[PDB]
Structure 1
Amino acid sequence: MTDEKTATARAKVVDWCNELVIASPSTKCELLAKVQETVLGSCAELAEEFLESVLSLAHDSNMEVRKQVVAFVEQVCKVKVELLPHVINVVSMLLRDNSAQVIKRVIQACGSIYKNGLQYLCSLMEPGDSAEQAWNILSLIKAQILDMIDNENDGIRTNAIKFLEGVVVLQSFADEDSLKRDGDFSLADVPDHCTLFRREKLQEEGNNILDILLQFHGTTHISSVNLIACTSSLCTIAKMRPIFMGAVVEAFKQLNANLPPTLTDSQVSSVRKSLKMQLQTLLKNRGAFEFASTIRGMLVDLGSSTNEIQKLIPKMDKQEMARRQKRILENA
């Protein structure tokens, strides 16, 4: 069965796409917001045949226009993820951008793009050549952003740390102690039928990115913003994947005993207030059972009372406790 809705929507966007080639950067951004609203919303079927019209604007001189293109590609991977191999090249290219404001926006977008991209490529039974090449670009995006922890711009470093957090979480296995999160995806959700990549190689990479985050967290000349961001990212990784709990508790212990001498008094207070919150969050996780006394010690050093700390420890039955206590003795 048919109606007029699709043809009327197509005529509305054909006009808007034609205006773009002669429009001002302010008008170009207004037109793109309307094109996105219809082509990825009101009439989602039109998306494929208006892709090149929008992706061409990635080369535009105005940074706001380039940023609007990023917002479009991010939306594509959310609603029409099957189109990922046709938009993913633009993302990798826009990570070479000269504008720091553009790079930051691309890093932000890569969070959902990488997750949606990994989920979609996993689902494919007979993956084509388009799938292998989309995965190659996604692998290169991870390496591109990983390099940006050494970028000279503090904003770029902050965004890069946040991106790397989601990769570790995706490229590790969830367990029974993992914090309950609705859209959570781990290596356990990656099928054995998948030929594109091996679960063990992704785990190896996740472990290497974690090692880089732990090492970055412990440097002497890290900025207060990068340090607070790295601390909360390490906390998210340990509460999501409690296999990394011991390593994260050790990094927090080492930080509190050696605050970078580059921090001002005000920055030390800010870092310590955030660290206190991360330790409270971790102490609520059942997987922090072994480290409860170490966490308590740090929370006492940071000004928490006996009763404030005590209320955070989850209640456990003696059978669960004995299961954990024996496993801790076994692992050693």
Structure 2
Amino acid sequence: KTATARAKVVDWCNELVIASPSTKCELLAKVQETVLGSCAELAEEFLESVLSLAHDSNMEVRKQVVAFVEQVCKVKVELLPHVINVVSMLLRDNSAQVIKRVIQACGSIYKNGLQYLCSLMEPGDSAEQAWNILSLIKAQILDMIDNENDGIRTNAIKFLEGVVVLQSFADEDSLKRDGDFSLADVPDHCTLFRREKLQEEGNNILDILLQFHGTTHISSVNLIACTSSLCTIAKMRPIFMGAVVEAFK
């Protein structure tokens, strides 16, 4: 039933308060399975209790909260506003492993977020506020290709790749991929932001990638990832193929 599913979550949450890191990770997984699956109507009630562990001192625990937040945005995107702040602050984490994980989660979070927010007719102030945190997140990650952790850069590159593809127009020559989404898919009525500003932002993110590509001390891992994303961009959005080929030569 529902009262019994909720009763277990309450017990699981109360144990989170006193559990070991390892067990906290296990209880988060269980709570997620229930409030974001089996009994999804329970999600909002326990959001607070879960988001609280974003402050835990153990990084594995924090990475677990990241997984929970990414899930929230795949299946309960209405709650994106209530979890999007954790995303942004965890991008300022002290652990690189946590940041690399957050950057990864942002790929789907930003995409799902964009698809949701731009679909709302006359979005409220919570929607608008959330859209701003997303804009801030894009900036936070953009600055990270200059981070000193190689892995953080690799992830940032990939994340930026998807924003470019999202914030651009797919033409009749765009490589075909099933999940593709572009500025062309944005409803005409939407007024939360508007095509050209994102298109310009996308163009600029590309400039940074093209630029980063030719930096003398780019790591071999960062070169592959950057080269790869550039090719993907050039294939998904041909309009950029000129600039990409120029960078390659």
Stretches of structure 2 lacking an aligned partner (at least 5 in a row) = none
Aligned-residue Cα RMSD (Å) equals 0.6
What SS does the aligned partner of 2:118 have? helix
**Displacement of 1:78 after TM fit?**
0.1
**Displacement of 1:12 after TM fit?**
1.2
Deviation string 1:180-210 (CA, Å, 9 cap, x unpaired) is: 1111110001122112101000000000000
Q: 1:53 aligns with which of 44, 49, 55?
A: 49
**Rounded Cα–Cα distance in structure 2 between residues aligned with 1:41 and 1:235:** 37
Deviation string 1:151-193 (CA, Å, 9 cap, x unpaired) is: 0110111010000000000000001111111111100011221
Write out the 4+ residue segments of structure 1 that deviate beyond 3 Å after TM superposition.
none
Percent identity over the alignment? 100
Question: Could you say which residue in structure 2 is the equivalent of 1:172?
Answer: 168
Q: Looking at CA atoms only, which structure, 1 or 2, has the larger radius of gyration?
A: 1
Deviation string 1:72-116 (CA, Å, 9 cap, x unpaired) is: 000000000010000000000001101000000000000000000
**Rounded Cα–Cα distance in structure 2 between residues aligned with 1:77 and 1:214:** 30
What SS does the aligned partner of 1:177 have? coil
What SS does the aligned partner of 1:123 have? coil
Question: Could you say which residue in structure 1 is the equivalent of 2:103?
Answer: 107
Stretches of structure 1 lacking an aligned partner (at least 5 in a row) = 251-332
Question: Could you say which residue in structure 2 is the equivalent of 1:207?
Answer: 203
**Rounded Cα–Cα distance in structure 2 between residues aligned with 1:204 and 1:22:** 49
Deviates more, 1:184-193 or 1:203-212: 184-193
**Rounded Cα–Cα distance in structure 1 between residues aligned with 2:166 and 2:41:** 30
Q: Does 1:246 align with 2:242?
A: yes
What SS does the aligned partner of 2:225 have? helix
**Rounded Cα–Cα distance in structure 1 between residues aligned with 2:61 and 2:3:** 27
**Rounded Cα–Cα distance in structure 2 between residues aligned with 1:152 and 1:211:** 20
**Rounded Cα–Cα distance in structure 2 between residues aligned with 1:83 and 1:181:** 28
Greater relative CO (CA pairs within 8 A, separation 6+) = 2
Q: 1:226 aligns with which of 222, 227, 245?
A: 222
**Rounded Cα–Cα distance in structure 2 between residues aligned with 1:18 and 1:215:** 50
Deviation string 1:30-55 (CA, Å, 9 cap, x unpaired) is: 10011001110111110010000100
**Rounded Cα–Cα distance in structure 1 between residues aligned with 2:14 and 2:217:** 51
Deviation string 1:122-162 (CA, Å, 9 cap, x unpaired) is: 11002000011101100000000000011011011101000
What SS does the aligned partner of 2:175 have? coil
**Displacement of 1:216 after TM fit?**
0.5
Deviation string 1:237-277 (CA, Å, 9 cap, x unpaired) is: 01111111111122xxxxxxxxxxxxxxxxxxxxxxxxxxx
